[PDB]
UniProtKB/Swiss-Prot annotation, chain B:
Described function: Interferon-induced dynamin-like GTPase with potent antiviral activity against human immunodeficiency virus type 1 (HIV-1). Acts by targeting the viral capsid and affects the nuclear uptake and/or stability of the HIV-1 replication complex and the subsequent chromosomal integration of the proviral DNA. Exhibits antiviral activity also against simian immunodeficiency virus (SIV-mnd). May play a role in regulating nucleocytoplasmic transport and cell-cycle progression.
Protein known as: Interferon-induced GTP-binding protein Mx2
Gene designation per UniProt: MX2
Complete-protein stretch covered: 661 to 711 of 715
Induction note: By type I and type III interferons.
Top-rank taxon: Eukaryota
Compartment(s) of residence: Cytoplasm; Nucleus; Nucleus, Nuclear pore complex
Organism name: Homo sapiens (Human)
Similarity comment text for this entry: Belongs to the TRAFAC class dynamin-like GTPase superfamily. Dynamin/Fzo/YdjA family.
Length: 310, 51
């Protein structure tokens, strides 16, 4: 039941702060996708505020998005890697600060860095769960570098995704082939069945012609190797992100768009249900990965006492 | 048993999962490559000094 599953999540969060980030098969929701796929745009619809689209901007370093749900009025804060706890106050102030963080953490833009940032939002309107945003796979050279920066990103990703209880969340534009998409190849190396891999659809606003519709018919009947199927996230208009109009209104504007056109109605209901459940699906998977992991977590820690003490 | 291990080869999607990275031995394989290479071309330069 609802109350008592909260602090089981808060244990893993306690572990990932206080305990060792290396080795340990820690429960964790991982986001995979390419720089300009809008994997940031999913988490911005998901929470309300997150890193700007701008001129081609995605995260350059692992960004921990902690979402907490409580009744009183919302708040934001980020913990820096230099041991500094920063209060941003209201969640509208979040975009301005995070863009600075990235820019600093990566060495004034260098494109890669494996130093964490840990962001928290507590608000009434967000699902309460923890998603980790790994740097988005760039397809062009970052600044004047002697790199090869996208390769360095892949190397960071493979390390996170290979652990058992890591949930693999893959983000695919609806008119682009899933099978083709680098993120799903990468996750096929750590998951060939499709068991802990989830596929989330983005960009339904560029489907105009029937070539697009034929790709939608194919993911409907699901010939791609996913066993937890697919979810459809509405990726939010240039005005909505710019002005920041509420997630209670956006719940109404997301749900409205899919229901009214019948083809979308069909893709949506086939894939899961008429009322999107992605958060409650992710919460279900998270808590099922946690409560099978308690003997294994107890045992890694106990073991690593004896290895390092010798 | 021998005949049974040839049954494993028949799938062509499992190659990258059957190979799954450790990955700190692999992380070290690049460093060791260098270090022995560097000790070689060190032993070579020195070999030529006394010859």
């Amino acid at each position: 039941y609802e109350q008592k599953v909260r602090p089981c999540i808060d244990l893993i969060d306690s572990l990932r702060a206080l305990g060792v980030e290396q080795d340990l098969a820690l429960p964790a929701i991982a986001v995979i996708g390419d720089q300009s796929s809008g994997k940031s745009s999913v988490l911005e619809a998901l929470s309300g505020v997150a890193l700007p689209r701008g001129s081609g901007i995605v995260t350059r370093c692992p960004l921990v998005l902690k979402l907490k749900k409580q009744p009183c009025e919302a708040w934001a804060g980020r913990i820096s890697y230099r041991n500094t706890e920063l209060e941003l106050q209201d969640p509208g102030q979040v975009e301005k600060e995070i863009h600075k963080a990235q820019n600093v953490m990566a060495g004034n833009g260098r494109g890669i860095s494996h130093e964490l940032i840990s962001l928290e939002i507590t608000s009434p309107e967000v699902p309460d769960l923890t998603i980790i945003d790994l740097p988005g796979i760039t397809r062009v050279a970052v600044d004047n570098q002697p790199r090869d920066i996208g390769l360095q990103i892949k190397a960071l990703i493979k390390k996170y995704i290979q652990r058992q209880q890591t949930i693999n969340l893959v983000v695919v534009p609806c008119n682009v082939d899933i099978a083709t998409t680098e993120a799903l190849s990468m996750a096929h190396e750590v998951d060939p069945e499709g068991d802990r891999t989830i596929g989330i659809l983005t960009k339904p606003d560029l489907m105009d012609r029937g070539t697009e519709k034929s790709v939608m018919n194919v993911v409907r009947n699901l010939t791609y190797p996913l066993k937890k199927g697919y979810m459809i996230v509405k990726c939010r208009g240039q005005q909505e992100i710019t002005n920041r109009l509420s997630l209670a209104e956006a719940t109404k504007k997301e749900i409205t768009f899919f229901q009214t056109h019948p083809y979308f109605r069909v893709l949506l209901e086939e894939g899961s249900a008429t009322v999107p459940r992605l958060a409650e699906r992710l919460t279900t998977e998270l808590i099922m990965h946690i409560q099978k992991s308690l003997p294994l977590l107890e045992g890694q820690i106990r073991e690593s006492h004896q290895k390092a003490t010798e | 048993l021998q005949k049974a291990m040839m049954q494993i080869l028949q799938e062509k999607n499992r190659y990258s999962w059957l190979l799954q990275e450790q990955s700190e031995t692999a992380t070290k394989r690049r460093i060791l490559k260098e270090r022995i290479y560097r000790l070689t071309q060190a032993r070579h330069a020195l070999c030529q000094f006394s010859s």
